[PDB]
Amino acid sequence: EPARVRCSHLLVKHSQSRRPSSWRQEQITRTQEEALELINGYIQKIKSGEEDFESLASQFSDCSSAKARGDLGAFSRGQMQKPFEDASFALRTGEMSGPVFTDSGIHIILRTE
């Protein structure tokens, strides 16, 4: 395992998120069921080729990293919420996670380095 990995992600928050607001929405009103529906919708469009991971994140990610087309830069273990960390370090470079759940909300993650 490398010291650090580089990943991009797409976050979908819900009303029960630890901080139910984002750059794109003053109050997150969607239900967590709806948030996971969106994430799985995104996964299937990216698998089919109909959508690009990084374009989706720049438009709809509730993380401010959307301005970076989803890129979070490099990080080591011990910095991110543990479920996020574990999924990231389990990916191969170029691979995409399934749904990842954290206190911030629901993620799909793409390891780039």
Ligand X SMILES: Cc1cccc(C[C@H](COP(=O)([O-])[O-])NC(=O)c2cc3ccccc3s2)c1
Chain residues binding ligand X by CB under 6 A are 9, 11, 18-19, 63-65, 68, 72-73, 80-81, 84, 102, 104
Residue 14 annotated among the catalytic residues of the structure: no
| Closer residue to ligand X in complex, CB, 46/80 | 80
Question: What sign has the CA pseudo-torsion 67, 69, 70, 71?
Answer: negative
Residue 107 annotated among the catalytic residues of the structure: yes
DSSP 24: T
Shortest reach from residue 49's CB to ligand X, in Å: 26
Please calculate the CA angle 42-60-9 and round it to the nearest 5 degrees: 70
Burial (CB count within 10 angstroms: exposed 0-12, middle 13-18, buried 19+), residue 75: middle
Residue 9 annotated among the catalytic residues of the structure: yes
Shortest reach from residue 68's CB to ligand X, in Å: 6
Residue 104 annotated among the catalytic residues of the structure: yes
Shortest reach from residue 42's CB to ligand X, in Å: 16
